[model samples]
Target: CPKVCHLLEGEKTIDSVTSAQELRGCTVINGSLIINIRGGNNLAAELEANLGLIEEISGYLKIRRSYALVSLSFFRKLRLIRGETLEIGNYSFYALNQNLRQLWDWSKHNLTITQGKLFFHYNPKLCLSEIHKMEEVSGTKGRQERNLKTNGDQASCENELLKFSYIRTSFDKILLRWEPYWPPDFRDLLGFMLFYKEAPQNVTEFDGQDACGSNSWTVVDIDPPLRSNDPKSQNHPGWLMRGLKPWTQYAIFVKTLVTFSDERRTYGAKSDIIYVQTDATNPSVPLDPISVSNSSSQIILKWKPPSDPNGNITHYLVFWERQAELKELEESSFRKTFEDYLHNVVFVPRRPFEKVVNKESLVISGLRHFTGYRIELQACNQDTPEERCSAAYVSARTMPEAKADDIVGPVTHEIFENNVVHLMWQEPKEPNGLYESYRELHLCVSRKHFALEVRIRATSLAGNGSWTEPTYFYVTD
Candidate 1:
C-alpha cells in the first residue's frame, strides 16, 4: 500500500488560517479533512507548499464558513476522496464558502468523490459552471437540491457570444442567421439587436458599431429564440432586412442582450463582423434629354446619367420617331376640339428607331427639315440583359432653311380719270419660315398720263425671293 498518514484523532481540523500549514506534505490522509480557515494573511506560497501534495482523503471533505478565499485551488494534486464517513447523511463533499469565486476544476485534476453526494451553497461569487463540471467528473448521483441556484448568486456567466453563421443578399434585401448565446438554462437572456451600415471602401467590419452609438448604423430589435431541452433541436434563428440599397456593400453584426430582474441591462460580446454586397438592380431613368442644337437634317441631343446608377453604365440607348403634326387639326374650331380630345391619349409605337452609343451625347441625323421628332434615352449596363430600363424624353424640331415661295396672284390695277393709278398684289404661297418683312418697295410714276411701273418681292430669315415681273399701267380721260 501507499504511505498513509493518520490524523491524531481520526479527524484533522483547520479552524484558523494559521493551522493550515500543519497538513503540509500530507500526500494521503486516512481521516476526514475539515477546513474553516478564516481571514488572515493570504500567503499563496505558504498554502501552496502546505496543501499542494494532498492527493487522497479517505473520509468526508468539508470546507465551510471560509473568508477571503477566492478558490480551493490549493488542493492542486488532489484526485480522489473515499466517503467512508459522511459529513451530512450520504454527502461526502460539502462546501459553504462565503467569498469563494471558484472551486477546483475537475478537468485539470480529474477529482472524484466515491459513495456520496455534494452540497454547495452560499458561494455568491463562484460561477455555477465550476460546480457542474465537478459533478460531471465525479459521477455523483443523488438530489441536486443545494448544488444549483444557490451558487453563482452574484455572478454573470457571460461567456463567448454566438456568431453569424450565414449571410445572403439580394438587390434590396439581406438574410442573416445565427444561434443564441445563452447557456442551457437560458439565464438572463433578453433578446438580440442587429446593427448594420453601408460599408466604406476596403472596409471589413463595422468598427465599434455594435455599441449602438450615433446614427451611423441602423439598429433592429429581434426576439429571443425559443427555449428547448436541446438547443440544437431548435430552429435556427434569422432576420430578413428589406429595402436595402442595391449593389452596395454593407457591414453587419449582432449583440446579445442580458437583463436582470432589477431592470439592469448589459450586452455580451459582439458577433463576428460580416460583409455582404447586394446584387445589382435596374438603374433609375436617365435625366430628360435636352436639345443642344438642330439643323435641316440633324438634331444634336445631350443628357445626364441616372441619379442612381445601381450598377456600372456601359452605354445609352436613344430612341426617336417623327412626332405627329397636329398643326392641321388646329386650323378649325372642330379640329381644335378633336386635338384636345386626342391630347389625353398617348401612343407609343411597337418599335421606334433605336441607336446605342457609349457617350452622353448623340447626333440624330437623316431627319427631314422643319419636322418634329420625339427623342428618348435609357442608360444600360452589361448586367442588364432584359429590357427593363426606363427612359426620359424630349421633343425637338429641325430648323427650316428654304426661302419663301412666289406670291400667288397677277398684279391687279385700277386707272383713274384724274391720272392716278392703284395697284395691289397677294402674299407668298409658302413662307417656308417666319415672315419678317417684305423688301422695301419703290414706285416710279408720272402724273402726266404716262405709264406707271412697280415690282414686289418677299423677304424672310432664310433669304429674299425673286421679284415679280414689272407691269405698266396708263390713265385715260
Candidate 2:
C-alpha cells in the first residue's frame, strides 16, 4: 500500500511519486498516474472515498487545494473568474472585478498570461501631478507681491512710488531699469515716468496698457522666465525687458495708477532706477583703394572694401572724376589768369557693392585702353541714411597704342643642357589717354649665348605722341 500525502498552497516539496496511489496525497504531479488496485490508497480510491464519487481518470493528475488544477493541454481555452485570485505555476494572478473593468477597457491587449504567468502592462500617460512638477522645474510659478511701507507716519500718497534713474536709447530700441522692488509684480499697476533730468516735476507717463506705439512704453510680461538658471538674474532680480530708439538718454519714474475695474484709488510702491549710454550713432566708413591695368585694348580697375567697419555696411559707391584744361591762343601774347586756367571736371558712378565681406573687390573692364583715371569711394550703412566718404583719391594710367610698342622674342638660350630661351618686352611707359591696341610676340630658339636690346613705341590715340623704352636681355649658352 502507498503512503498518503496532502498538498496545500504556499508549500514547497521535492517528493517524487510513481503510482496513482502515491500521488493521492500530493499537490501536483509531473507524469501520468497508474492505479492497479481499486480499493487501495490510489488516486481513484482517494477521490471515491473523499467525495463519495468516482469516475474514469486518465493521464497526469495535479490536485490543488480548493481549486482545480488545469492541464497544459487545455491552456488555450482557459477562462478566468471575476474577483478571484489564481496561482498558475510560478505566477500569482488576479482578475479585475466587474466594477473595475471599465478602468481597464483600453488595456485588454496589455493583460496577458503566458506559461502559467500573468502579466499586466499598460502605457503610463502623463498626469496633472507630472505637469505641475514640470511647471515648477521650468520656473513658471505666479509672481509674489510685497509691501514697501514708509518709515514714521509718512502718508502713502506722498511717498515716491517708483523711479528710473537713467534710460539709454538706440536707433530701434531702448534699455530702461529701475530700483529693485520688494515684490516684482507691482509693475503691473504702476505707470512709468520718463524725463530728461533727475527730480523733474513734470514727466512723460506711459501707461502699461499697450505693448508698442510711438513714444509709448510697454511692459513685457513673461509667464515662464527664460533661462532661469542664468546667474545674471540673481543680482538684477526682475523680469527681462527691452526698449526702442537710438542715441537718447532718459530717466524713468513708476507711479501707482488706478484701473477702470477698481473703484478705490490706491498707490503702489516705487522702484529705484539707474542710467546707461549707447555706442556711436552711425557706423564708420570703409577705405577701399584701387589699381588699374590695361591689356589687349582693355582697361581694368580693381578695388576692395575698407579694412575696418563699426556697423553693418550695406554697399560701396565708386565715383570717377575727369579733368580737362582749356587753352586760348593770342597773336602777339597770351595772358591767362588763375581762374581762366581752372580745369573742367565730370564725375561718373560705378558698380554698387554687393554682399561681399572679405576680398570685396570690384573689376571694371572695357574702358579706354590708354587713359588716365581718378576714382573715389563711399560706404553706405544698410539701416540708416548715413554715408561715409573716402579721405583720398586713386589714380591709374593705361598702356599706349599698338604702334608705340613692339614684341620681340626667339632670343633663346639654354640655362641647362636641354633648355631653350623665349623672351618678350613692351614700352616702359606711355602718355596718358593716347593708346589703343597692345603688341604681341612668339619666338623659338635653341641653346645659344646672346645679348639683345629692344625699343618699343606707342601710337597716338588722342593726339598724344608715343614713347619708347630700352630692354636688355642675356640668354644662357
lDDT scores for all predictions? 0.66, 0.33
lDDT of 1 by residue, 1-477 (tens): 354777777577674447777777776687887777665563334566777678888878888877655666666577887766456667788787666766664545577666766778788877887667776766463454233777786766655767777778888999999875662335445567888888844332222211112234678988776666774677666899998888788888887765443344343656766778888777777886688446677778888877777777767788887774623223433544476579757655675655565678888756666667778677766534664465687888777655435564666666765767666545555443322212255543233432323565544444556665666555344
Model 1: per-residue Cα lDDT at residue 252: 85
Model 2 segments more than 4 A misplaced: 1-166, 170-283, 294-311, 323-359, 383-392, 401-477
Candidate 2's residue-wise lDDT over 61-171, tens digit each?
Answer: 222211111111111111221111234333223121110111111212122222232222221221223223322332222242110111111123324454443454555
Best by lDDT: 1
Clashes of each: 0, 28
**Candidate 1 lowest-lDDT run of ten:** 205-214
Best by TM-score: 1
